[PDB]
Write a protein that binds this ligand. Structure first.
Ligand SMILES: [Zn+2]
Lengths: 251, 121, 56, 68, 233
RNA sequence: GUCUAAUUAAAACAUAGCAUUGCGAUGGUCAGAAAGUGAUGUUGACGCAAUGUGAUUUCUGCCCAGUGCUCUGAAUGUCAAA
RNA sequence: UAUAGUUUCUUUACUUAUUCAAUGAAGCGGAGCUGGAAUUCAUUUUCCACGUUCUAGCAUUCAAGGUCCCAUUCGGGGCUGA
């Protein structure tokens, strides 16, 4: 037949994310000496919208202890931080908002965000708007912490793995509608070329595995094996059930 | 035998001695004669009635010139050949592909005078 | 424009104060006060710490 | 001489000694560049067997190529 | 004095800037250096078989020094004195028709691996020296057993550079004596007594004993931590 | 709002909204002859990917036997090479 | 159910091989001072720290000091400060 849309999105000529209006990555400072033997102060100098993201960012400033300079960082802002603010980050720091205490140090019932997955990845977990991670419990002997992720997922990760305290900002965003293809246009044109989405069942069978027919109908069932291939994986993939769910996520 | 101190975590290439050449044979065996001299930079004057007006009025000279030249070489060359302090020099490339140099002299000189000194008017 | 800044002399470019043509004068005031105040605070903190832990 | 002893010992490819050295040298060559100048050969017996007479103008280059 | 004042700075974590401490341990070296060091490491870390590491048992420097003294006595001739010997003998065999025998016999040392190995195969040799520091160990690992089989004494000495300098080379990796004068033959005899006592009397058990397997500082420390906290009564 | 430039501008596509599916990075989807290669990703579940339906309001019934997708393995079924 | 050999499923251990990721390859590990607790059952048994938190300041010149030298002179160098 013919190559299809995802099967082109891999190559990524026109599907590369757009970058002109981003401040670079938002990341946690390196776990160098202080954050694993003590703490360090930094000044939230400003807060800024990053384009394509939904959360805002925090232009924070630390001082390289080895050299007379001011090393700048871009963090994600949690709700409650502000400008001209003293953010203390490390192991011997304090349990307030903005701080970067280790998960080994924090207690159960705690809220964190921008959590690492392995110490020295510098921000993986719960980086999007209004998403938080909750602590569950520790196994300090063989130092591990159980955490509940916004998918409900109970993961286990190390204890030196840092993570910012607070809830990520910009919450409530998807509580609002859009009402307008134009609003969605602007959204996805600053993110990446991912819109409009057109239906394969309206395409021709060369162009999709649903296309064609004198009636717009799929014909062959859309639940696709995980061990299918690149060209067949249009539809609901590795699915266990379909249809309207009535009840509970049950976890 | 003890170690050495190190203040940086970097290793960089040592600054060894950068030798200079000791050739066993000169390359091309001849110092090439000056490719560009007055007699090459100035091909000839220009004849047209417009040029005649410019020499008559502006105390200007109009030479056809090698396209490998420039105003520095031209000024030097005119000084060499004709013993004429040139004030300013302006140049173009004519679309028959050749350099044209207008040359404004100084009030100590008369371009018409030196043009008939050359022989042409 | 910047190259014109490079033309002009110093009088046209900054002010006779410490932090002449970099920071607002009121900000100069503010940060001077901040320095003096918190270094005094540091001192009294240091001495109360020293004396209480000397007792202890 | 020595070379007869060397060649026979090279035939004994699976002894503890030779496989230990195999291990060491393969680590060496793997952490080195993919084509690198060797100034003296690993197997001088075999090199002399093939034509490497030790003098000025004979060069060894060690190289790795992917298998399969 | 009264103007000067003791400032001292707080070089703590967040207080102040750090000074130019020494960081040679934390250096990004080049890769030949890394290869050197990590290679030596892996060689000790792997359970070496026994013929290797019945290497690794170099001589005490005293005995080594006396052996080197003796061999310096029995050193060969440099090309200059060789040439002048040749001029002498040329004139001598041109005038008297000597059969290249007016020049005396040499008594000196015999560098060369093929040479030395044939000398052992014929058992002409009284002593052999073997350098620990050879890059292809295959050149020499058999020599202990060979010298043991032909029954002659061998010394795993330290420094192919030293032997090369002994015999006017860069490196030689090996040397040997076959014919000594009586001026120091008894010195050689008690010497080889020490040598066989140190090598050919322990050949069997070192040939049994697998060496290496030595760990790093950190790993050793954690192992003995485990040890003390496990056997703690 | 967009399309069959040069016979079809429409009821077609899109759309917002609804719903479903996969994925916790040792990953999901996709790419590449390979590769110390790559797009999503300067990203991290209010996210990326794949589908269907098509504003709002109201409402979404019964069938899992078939075909698919998926979860069991407690099993004398079948059961390749080595 | 008990045997001398023979095979195979499982659990975990070692780092060096392999693999992942950072980093301008900076504070690794061990031991140790200096303090707190420890009950020391004899001397420490081990554990904790082992310079920073009201404030949108500032922190740089092989560090000042102290200390030992030099050739004192304009100054120069080493230990500690760490
Ligand atoms: Zn201001």
């Amino acid at each position: 037949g013919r190559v299809i849309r995802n099967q082109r999105k891999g190559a990524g000529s026109i599907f590369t994310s757009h970058t002109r209006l981003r401040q670079g990555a938002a990341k946690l400072r390196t776990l160098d000496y202080a954050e694993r033997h003590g703490y360090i102060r930094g000044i939230v100098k400003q807060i800024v919208h990053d384009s394509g993201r939904g959360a805002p960012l925090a232009k924070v400033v630390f001082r390289d202890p080895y050299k007379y300079r001011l090393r700048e960082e871009i963090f994600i802002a949690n709700e409650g931080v502000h400008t001209g603010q003293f953010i203390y980050a490390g192991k011997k720091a304090s349990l307030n908002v903005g701080n970067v205490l280790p998960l080994g140090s924090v207690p159960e019932g705690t809220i964190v965000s921008n959590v690492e997955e392995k110490p020295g990845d510098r921000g993986a977990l719960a980086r999007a708007s209004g998403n938080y991670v909750i602590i569950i419990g520790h196994n300090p002997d063989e130092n591990k912490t159980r955490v509940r992720l916004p998918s409900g997922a109970k993961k286990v990760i190390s204890s030196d793995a840092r993570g910012v305290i607070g809830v990520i900002a910009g919450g409530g965003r998807v509580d609002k509608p859009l009402l307008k293809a134009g609003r969605a246009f602007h959204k996805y044109r600053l993110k990446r070329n991912s819109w409009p989405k057109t239906r394969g069942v309206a395409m021709n069978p060369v162009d999709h595995p649903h296309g064609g027919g004198n009636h717009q109908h799929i014909g062959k069932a859309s639940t696709i094996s995980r061990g299918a291939v690149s060209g067949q994986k249009a539809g609901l993939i590795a699915a266990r059930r379909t249809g309207l769910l009535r009840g509970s996520q049950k976890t | 035998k003890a170690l050495k101190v190190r203040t940086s975590a970097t290793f960089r290439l040592p600054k060894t001695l950068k030798l200079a050449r000791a050739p066993k044979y000169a390359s091309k065996a001849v110092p090439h004669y000056n490719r560009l001299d007055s007699y090459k930079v100035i091909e000839q004057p220009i004849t047209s009635e417009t040029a005649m007006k410019k020499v008559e009025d502006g105390n200007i000279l109009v030479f056809q010139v090698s396209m490998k030249a420039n105003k520095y070489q031209i000024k030097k060359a005119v000084k060499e050949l004709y013993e004429v302090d040139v004030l300013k020099v302006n140049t173009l490339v004519r679309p028959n592909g050749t350099k044209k140099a207008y040359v404004r002299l100084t009030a100590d000189y008369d371009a018409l005078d030196i043009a008939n000194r050359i022989g042409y008017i | 424009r910047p190259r014109q800044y490079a033309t002009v002399s110093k009088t046209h470019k900054t002010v006779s104060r410490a932090y002449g043509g970099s920071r607002c004068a009121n900000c100069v005031k503010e940060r001077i006060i901040r320095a003096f105040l918190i270094e005094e605070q540091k001192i009294v903190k240091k001495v109360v710490k020293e004396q209480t832990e000397a007792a202890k | 001489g020595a070379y007869k002893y060397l060649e026979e010992l090279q035939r004994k490819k699976q002894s503890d000694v030779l496989r230990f050295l195999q291990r060491v040298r393969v680590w060496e060559y793997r952490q080195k560049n993919v084509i690198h100048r060797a100034a003296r050969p690993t197997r001088p017996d075999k090199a002399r067997r093939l034509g490497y007479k030790a003098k000025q103008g004979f060069v060894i280059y060690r190289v790795r190529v992917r298998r399969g | 004095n009264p103007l000067t004042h003791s400032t001292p700075k707080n070089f703590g974590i967040g207080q102040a800037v750090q000074p130019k401490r020494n960081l040679s341990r934390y250096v990004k070296w080049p890769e030949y250096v890394r290869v050197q060091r990590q290679k030596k490491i892996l060689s000790i870390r792997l359970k070496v078989p026994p013929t290797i590491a019945q290497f690794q048992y170099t001589l005490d420097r005293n005995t080594a020094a006396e052996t080197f003294k003796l061999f310096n006595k029995y050193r060969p001739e440099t090309a200059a004195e060789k040439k002048e010997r040749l001029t002498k003998e040329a004139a001598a065999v041109a005038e008297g028709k000597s059969k290249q025998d007016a020049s005396p016999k040499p008594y000196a040392v015999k560098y060369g691996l093929n040479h030395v190995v044939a000398l052992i195969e014929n058992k002409k040799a009284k002593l052999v020296l073997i350098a620990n520091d050879v890059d292809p160990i295959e050149l020499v690992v058999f020599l202990p057993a060979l010298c043991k089989k032909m029954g002659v004494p061998y010394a795993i000495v330290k420094g192919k550079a030293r032997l090369g300098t002994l015999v006017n080379q860069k490196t030689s990796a090996v040397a040997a004596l076959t014919e000594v004068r009586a001026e120091d033959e008894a010195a050689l005899a008690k010497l080889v007594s020490t040598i066989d006592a140190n090598f050919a009397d322990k050949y069997d058990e070192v040939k049994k004993h697998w060496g290496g397997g030595i760990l790093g500082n950190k790993a050793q420390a954690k192992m003995d931590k485990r040890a003390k906290n496990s056997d703690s009564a």
